[PDB]
Every structure is written in C-alpha cells, then in structure tokens.
Amino acid sequence: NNRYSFIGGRTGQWQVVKIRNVLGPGLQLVEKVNILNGAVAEIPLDSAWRLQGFASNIRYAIRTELEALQAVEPMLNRAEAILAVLIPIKKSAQWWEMAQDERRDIFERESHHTAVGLEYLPGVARRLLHCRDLGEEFDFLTWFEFAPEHSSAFNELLLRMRASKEWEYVEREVEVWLKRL
C-alpha cells in the first residue's frame, strides 16, 4: 500500500518536539503523531488533524541523479535516527500550470534541489509523498529523519532551500519536529 496518514493527536510513534508555522495557516500543536500505512476515513479519538499522501514515481530526477542518490542515501528506520521532521508543502497555481520542462528547469537547473540535498546525505534520510491529486490542503508531505548530530545541518538545509527560486512558488509550509518514542 502506497498511502500514508499522519494523525496529529494524543497517540502515535513520535512525540512532537515543536511545530514551526513557517508560511500560511499553521497546524495545531499536539502531543504526538501517529503514522498509518493506509487511508484512514474516520478521525481518531482525541486528534486535531490528519494529513495523507502517497508514494509515487519520479517526476524530475534524471538517471545520473538517481545513481548519485542511490550511492549515498540512507534507509529509513536507522537505529540512530531518533529525530524526524514532517514538512507539508503547498505550491502555487502558477507552478502547477507550468509545463514539465519549465518546472524541471526551476527545480534543478536554477534551484539545484538535488545537488544541494545530496550535500546532507548520508546523514538525512527522506521520503516524499504526494497529495495534491487527493484534494488535500497541501501538495506534498515531506519526511526527514536523522540522528541529533545532524540537526544543525538540517536547519541550514531548510534555509538554503527557502532561498531558492523553487521556493518562490511555495505558498504554505509547516515544520513538525518529532522525536521517536
């Protein structure tokens, strides 16, 4: 099953350390996040929000980029990776109306998204989930996990991505920092 749900509330595998409402409407602070592999039609007991998305095919990365990523990218669920950050992202209408070449040019040629992110591997593991096509309020759910030794580096990455051309099209962003229970 390629669908994942993230329920903010009183139960889950992850304790919420903090929520930073970076851009646009925020997410209610809660005690924990519960992650479920599957859709979840009915709101859990004592929960404040649910986010959902699916794992999908590659949309931008070219073969040589995939080869570079595969050589260094870590797996999820490393024993040392006790911190995580869930970052829902929405991009503007102006982005989604662009053609494929226009988007790829902004994403890599101008913003160097993959080349910058590679600078943070193997420390940071990640998962990308898509949800615009489900009708959700965000377009992406992005997930990152790492040992505490990489927290400073991860915060620098965030600032570097926010300085990029690609980020001129980001309309909503929240950071949910988590610690593994």
Add this chain to the structure above:
Amino acid sequence: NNRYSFIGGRTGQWQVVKIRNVLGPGLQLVEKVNILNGAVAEIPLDSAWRLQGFASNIRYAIRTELEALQAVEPMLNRAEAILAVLIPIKKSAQWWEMAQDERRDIFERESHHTAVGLEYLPGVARRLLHCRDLGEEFDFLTWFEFAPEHSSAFNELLLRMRASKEWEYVEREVEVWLKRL
C-alpha cells in the same frame, strides 16, 4: 473535483458499442457506462466494474508542445462528438522504475507520442486520468470522443501508437467503445 468514476453496468449516459480486450485481462461486457465526477465507494448492484482516476498536472509535455496542443485541441462535449472510447492502460514495472529523462525520451524522442497525436486534432477530443497512485488495476484511464467522421482515423491512430516503443511497456489495455445517449 478532479476524480472521475466509470461504472460499467445497466445505466449511464453512454451505451457500450463493443469492448476489445486488447492485451491482458479484459473488462466484462456491459450495456452502458455511467460517468460520475467524484469517487464511488458503493458500486451499483447491476454494475460489473468500476474504474476511477484523477486529472493531474502535466508529466512530459514541454511548453512548445502545450502551445501546439492549445492551438488545435477541441473542447469536450461538442455536439457532434457522439462516439467515445475509454481505454484503460497499465504500464510495466520496468517503465515505472525508469527515471524521468528515460521516460520522456521514450515517450517523445523515440515514440513521438504528442507529434503523432496532434495529427488527429481537431477531430479527436481527449482527457487523461491517472490512477496507478490510487492502487487501481490500471495506471491510466484515457478518454477520446469524436464524430463518426473520424472513427477510421482514430482506428489508425490506435494502430500507430501500438507500434511504438512506448507500447513495448504497455502490459494491459482494453478499448470500451461508446455512443452518447
């Protein structure tokens, strides 16, 4: 709402003219197709199958290709467009594992998918729906509609596409020919 369902059964806006089970498991012959904008968790009793997909962003077409398409592509629901064909398609695991550049090169550089398709406009109107990401048995639901005038041309187009490199990755395909009621 970006989701569409196609219910094969005894009711609907479209009468089934024929079903050709081109490759892989077919779809049961039925009297009619009912098309609904929205999902349908409860399939009607006298219906045989339900297909669903969503409209999404562009995956391959470049700006100059979109411009060419926009100059000539017809609207849906033209008065004369009394014939349609619903063609669910599934592509292989080897296709999906390829990177974005590899897929674009097969789609256009080798197969000329858009250049060939443009030869059949304005006669043929179309919609593309995506459903691999919903866990459906097919990956795409493709829809075409046109006057009787263009049936012979549409049949030529089908044969041309099936001769392409891109088609070497198609592993399931069915044609549901319809007439507007």
